[PDB]
Amino acid sequence: ACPAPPPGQPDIRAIGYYTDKAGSVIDPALQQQNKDATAPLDRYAADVARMSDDYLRNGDPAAAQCTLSWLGAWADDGAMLGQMIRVNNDQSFYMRQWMLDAVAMAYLKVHDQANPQQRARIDPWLQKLARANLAYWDNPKRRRNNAYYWGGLGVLATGLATDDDALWQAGHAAFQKGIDDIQDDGSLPLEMARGQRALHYHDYALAPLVMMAELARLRGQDWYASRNHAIDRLARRVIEGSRDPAWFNQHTGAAQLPLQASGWVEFYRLRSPDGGVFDAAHARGPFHSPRLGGDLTLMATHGIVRTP
């Protein structure tokens, strides 16, 4: 059944790979360096997403218990509670938010199988990771773009899974900053500044906002309603952009790398079907994203959590 977890390194040394002020032009050499430096961390997230996927699929306690064993090792190791090393930007910080997103969701998914010793071992670790990612945004010179929405998702999943009301509320605030920034356009000013990756970054911003709204929904809260379903304008801007990038081309003045919408469609489809405009993207599934919690198709259809 359960293979030996990989080691849990305390430091992250990730590398930024955009050459230009707009962060739209990839230096292939730096991109390869960042891929190689983050491979073990990505493998851990992919694995913990998948083993928690398996437990959601057929309620097999072996799947959950292996997930819990893997999380408990990195908890015991104090994985990613060391130094976030800056090479040429904050890539190490972003990577810890994506990692917390992956590990916190996996934990939530298998939480109902967690015994008191497992809870007691994992919760403190997730709470420390969440509090450290929050420390990163106590600085007002750090512009709250999609990175803050990715930060929020892990903080929030942590708040829900470990029942910490303060982290839950900090998560909500991150969500609320995103919804507040949505123009009547459906655009996000800080994402419109990312040249040929504006459409990519509208998709990439919307995705953690949708997953955060799905976590609120597990507590019977409707955050999608906020500012008259402002999120719907962004959902509709992105999916239009995937069939035809004229609007973003005109409004960024920059030819848009084509986009296929990511697995936020699988949830949002069910909440606001908006004439079926999300079904073409739905057809291309299933959608796997460890940093969104894993198999989004599976979670939207049967639930993020097996028992409320």
Curated annotation (Swiss-Prot):
InterPro entries: Alginate_lyase_dom, Chondroitin_lyas. One of its GO terms (biological process) is polysaccharide catabolic process. It catalyses: Eliminative cleavage of alginate to give oligosaccharides with 4-deoxy-alpha-L-erythro-hex-4-enuronosyl groups at their non-reducing ends and beta-D-mannuronate at their reducing end; [hyaluronan](n) = n 3-(4-deoxy-beta-D-gluc-4-enuronosyl)-N-acetyl-D-glucosamine + H2O; Eliminative cleavage of (1->4)-beta-D-glucuronans to give oligosaccharides with 4-deoxy-beta-D-gluc-4-enuronosyl groups at their non-reducing ends. Complete degradation of glucuronans results in the formation of tetrasaccharides. Optimum pH for enzymatic activity is substrate-dependent, with optimal hyaluronate degradation at pH 5, poly-beta-D-glucuronate degradation at pH 7, and alginate degradation at pH 9. A lipid is attached at C2 (N-palmitoyl cysteine). Belongs to the polysaccharide lyase 5 family. Changing N146L: Less than 0.5% of wild-type activity against all substrates. One of its GO terms (cellular component) is periplasmic space. Is inhibited by mono- and divalent cations as well as L-ascorbic acid 6-hexadecanoate. Changing H200F: Increases activity and specificity toward poly-ManA. It is a lipid-anchor. It comes from Stenotrophomonas maltophilia (strain K279a). GO terms for molecular function: glucuronan lyase activity; hyaluronate lyase activity; poly(beta-D-mannuronate) lyase activity. Pfam families: Alginate_lyase. A lipid is attached at C2 (S-diacylglycerol cysteine). Its EC number is 4.2.2.-, 4.2.2.3, 4.2.2.1, 4.2.2.14. Polysaccharide lyase that catalyzes the depolymerization of several anionic polysaccharides via a beta-elimination mechanism. Exhibits broad substrate specificity, catalyzing the degradation of not only alginate and poly-beta-D-mannuronate (poly-ManA), but poly-beta-D-glucuronate (poly-GlcA or poly-GlcUA) and hyaluronate (HA) as well. The oligosaccharide products formed by enzymatic cleavage are comprised mainly of disaccharides, with a lower abundance of trimers and pentamers. Is not active on poly-D-galacturonate, heparin and heparin sulfate. It is found in: Cell outer membrane. Disulfide bonds: none annotated. Its main location: membrane. This is Polysaccharide lyase. It comes from the Bacteria. Keywords: Carbohydrate metabolism, Cell outer membrane, Lipoprotein, Lyase, Membrane, Palmitate, Polysaccharide degradation, Signal.
